[PDB]
Design a protein around this ligand. Structure first.
Ligand SMILES: CC(C)C[C@H](N)C(=O)O
Ligand SMILES: CC(C)C[C@H](N)C(=O)O
Ligand SMILES: CC(C)C[C@H](N)C(=O)O
Ligand SMILES: CC(C)C[C@H](N)C(=O)O
Ligand SMILES: CC(C)C[C@H](N)C(=O)O
Ligand SMILES: CC(C)C[C@H](N)C(=O)O
Ligand SMILES: CC(C)C[C@H](N)C(=O)O
Ligand SMILES: CC(C)C[C@H](N)C(=O)O
Ligand SMILES: [Ca+2]
Ligand SMILES: [Ca+2]
Ligand SMILES: [Ca+2]
Ligand SMILES: [Ca+2]
Ligand SMILES: [Ca+2]
Ligand SMILES: [Ca+2]
Ligand SMILES: [Ca+2]
Ligand SMILES: [Ca+2]
Ligand SMILES: [Ca+2]
Ligand SMILES: [Ca+2]
Ligand SMILES: [Ca+2]
Lengths: 155, 154, 154, 158, 157, 156, 156, 154
């Protein structure tokens, strides 16, 4: 159905604390336990909540190097498919978007250090047949990073 | 200091963060009590910085996802005011000071191309520190996960 | 050769291509009998290539106006085939071979980024001649008129 | 929305008018399968409710000695109303037909016509660049017009 | 090799601007007897310094109102560089050509009547050539300065 | 305005290659008597067709074996584009200078003895100029073709 | 993995600056006994720390007036990265070669006599090589700083 | 004054800077006494500007080699202050004013990406003269020698 302010605040609270209890959740939305849990399921089935996940600290797991790699695919057949299917099998790459502009594709990957990166790029990214060109930048400082989408545009 | 079981939790949790101790204990092949101290222990540390509900963007009218490349003005204030402003802009999820010709990279979600129009013109570029902005748009999500790779710890 | 009076006709007609022979007789200080000949003499010659209804994009749900900067292959007939193709794509209104870094420039209209994505990925780039493309979108229309300047003719 | 108030014939009106904009209700109606009174009804509503914003004559640039079509990319300055004053001034330049605030490296893109490269030189050096807001300009020219129509596509409303 | 002095340099300075002075005139401007003056100038030619005497026309005056600078990029063959060079030599509208450093392989200086004329060249000749991978051209809005004259002061001690 | 006929142009073609001919020598190839042939070339040079006769020297022969094409950016100011234009005119090592379209504001053609002299130029004088915002220079590796001669077939 | 003692650093600081020193001279700079200076040093050399001792010459002194940096791009063909690598190793005019991140695939530092020398190298060697897709070179106008000495205070 | 022998001295010494005169005097086909005579004069002139020990970065924990393309502010003499500063930063081994888009180029070494970040953001960009910096990093070292070519002197 349509989301009303109640359905939003849930999403708002949950995008920030996705491991709450239905009890805690209700206590933060002015809802009764059962009526809360009903509305959350609706939201889940209707694709609105696509996954509950535990966000780790990159540094905590020795992942220092956060890479933004701008690749450029080949003008060949099934080059964009093979590439896509490949990038889906590389755990070091978390995200991947076909972008407007000079950049054909953009990858956000994590690595131990520059060595790890060098090995990745040289012996896997660039080895892929469909990769024609790669060009990568590194994060010096994380100004802001959240998974929480904006929701005021539904009020 | 992490160990093999300690880790296997993280892999499981990263993908299903809303598990029950009983369930998580099961997978990591632990008992609830010793499982729970570990999972806690890991949070105590900061290994897990948050559990979050991940939303479908289109599901919520946000169809337009932009990566903007901003270049900040060269002044002592410029970097901090801008930093403090971008933290207060909810349509922008991420922000990174990068290497290369791009000084700062912004990830943001918007309702449609018009919404973007008002954001950049009436907020982004209006900010005194913002000297120039240059933006691209996602045509296709090939892959998007939040789960870090962990095999380099084994 | 056009005289000051012919010039006034074309200027009036470029702005209201539906104007009556009478009001035209007025705006150009003439009689409707001769005045009509001047216009006929124009259409018939070839100064006036077309009269058109201009619609408002938003009005018909075309909120996304695109400018695509293509690069054609260095093929004997890549130039021909592509040109033939862009002629049949109703989403692309104009197409120019420019000077500079860009080989061709396309101005075209879409419903939304989705409609775009499908066009660029399944039709633009799928075309054999198209080597690479990079497009930018219209945040704001500061001015847009089909009327040419004519003061250089007096 | 355009599916709530528009039906087959209404969309055939706008297709036919976009290409032959200076007819008469009878002439047009004589081509959409209607009559000189009902056709007017639907027609007087399209241009009443914002659809048909203008009827215009389209001239041949070379015909009127305009043989140099230029696509200038301008970067505005980070003053304040730099963006206002520029916008206001672009509208006063007859040589500049269109002006758009685009995404990408370019801030604004102007489409303009001139007589010859001299005319253009004088325009850029003496006007575009002389304006206080214009920080930089870079311009390319049209070598060959592959396709140019003012008519929008409407098949997305069916 | 020759040894050039004040009086020989002046000869070259004077000639680089007035390539049509007589020997007499030239002899008075540099303060020499016509006879040895002449010898000198022939010596200066005989030494390879004076490559050519030419008349310089005003493009505008001969309806070549549009001057271009075309940054062309040559394909990767072996013969591409030579075929292209040898073809550019035969294009009269193309006056100069230079293999430059940086992102440009070759830079061309060419003159045309107008943009139609240019369009016709680029699309039907330059890009038609098998070696030309890509072209990217700009045009002269204003000629702030243009001289054939080399500087020679560095030679004076 | 002068109305150029088939012969007049020839006179320009032949001159553009050999600008030091004797009026007789010219008479003898243009198909004009020494009197008319003479008067015309004057009509031509007075009209503004023939703007000058110059000796063309060999760069390398005079130790100048480093040709530079500088792409410069001028600061947008009231006293900017003027001052720079006037300065470039008094810089002997810069032969030509063009305000061209595209990403470059100005293109400069300049000759130097070596990379060091260049260095001194750009650092101490080109970039020291207050109008000069940015400089980006390349160098000629090989001169495929260089002629002063304009084409004139378009007038036939 | 290292965490060298407060003077073991010093030895490598001094030796990076005066690499032909006599153990006696080395001792009077780090304030050790003349014997422990071949102990501390023995160890360091006997690891991988000191890769080599070289005489550094003055480029203009040997006529190499033209120091150039070349941004090369490999073909995304086959073993292009190998053949090229092995070839750059054989070109003595090319001192350094680094595979960088960014729009540039490879960066080369080289030295030449004058701009001509460079032209011959580029057209007749670099670009002739099968793997080299495009080259793009800038030159050094002025050397602000140049030392072979690595910073070591991060080990204290 | 720089004959064939003097070059065979320099070729040998650039590779083995700590070469025994006994050995050196052999590798050039000289007797010891006149060999020591030639090298001396070669360094008393300036040909041999320094003898130095070259270390292995990885060995000293400097994993990140990096090329920063600086751009100096066109101020009164930012050019001077910056130069004087860059000589005081030991992390930056070399700095060159190059032709092209790049005003200055710096070659510098660091421990890790964080060290780098600290330098750029708190030292490089904080200097008043620095208008912008863009930096690329060494993925792999195909070749690096301090020895110049000398065949051109034969
Ligand atoms: C798929 C991408 C390469 C599309 C391209 N960036 C464009 O703007 O059209
Ligand atoms: C802080 C940023 C301006 C850093 C810059 N993008 C770099 O390459 O180091
Ligand atoms: C209107 C402009 C300031 C827009 C900006 N250049 C962009 O890339 O989106
Ligand atoms: C048709 C295009 C490839 C022409 C090219 N952009 C030029 O400036 O010459
Ligand atoms: C005067 C110059 C700065 C003009 C500029 N190159 C342009 O194409 O608009
Ligand atoms: C060697 C190159 C292809 C590396 C690439 N330019 C990058 O930034 O990762
Ligand atoms: C002739 C060109 C291919 C030279 C190349 N642009 C360079 O900088 O070395
Ligand atoms: C010193 C630098 C600003 C010089 C500039 N890179 C040029 O090519 O002229
Ligand atoms: Ca692209
Ligand atoms: Ca979408
Ligand atoms: Ca930058
Ligand atoms: Ca809009
Ligand atoms: Ca191009
Ligand atoms: Ca034309
Ligand atoms: Ca911009
Ligand atoms: Ca002109
Ligand atoms: Ca090149
Ligand atoms: Ca030379
Ligand atoms: Ca490393």
């Amino acid at each position: 159905l349509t989301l009303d302010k109640t359905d939003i605040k849930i999403l708002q609270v949950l995008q920030e604390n996705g491991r709450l209890t239905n009890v805690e959740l209700s206590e933060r939305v002015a809802l009764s336990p059962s009526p809360c849990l009903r509305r959350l399921k609706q939201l889940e089935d209707a694709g609105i909540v696509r996954q509950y996940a535990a966000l780790l600290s990159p540094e905590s797991v020795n992942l220092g190097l956060q890479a933004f790699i701008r690749v450029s695919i080949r003008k060949a057949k099934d080059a964009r498919e093979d590439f896509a299917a490949s990038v889906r099998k590389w755990p070091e790459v978390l995200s991947c978007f076909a972008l407007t502009g000079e950049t054909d594709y953009l990858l956000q990957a994590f690595f131990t250090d520059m060595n790890a990166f060098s090995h990745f790029v040289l012996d896997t990214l660039l080895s892929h047949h469909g990769v024609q060109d790669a060009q990568s930048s590194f994060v010096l400082k994380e100004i802001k990073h959240t998974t929480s989408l904006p929701l005021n545009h539904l009020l």
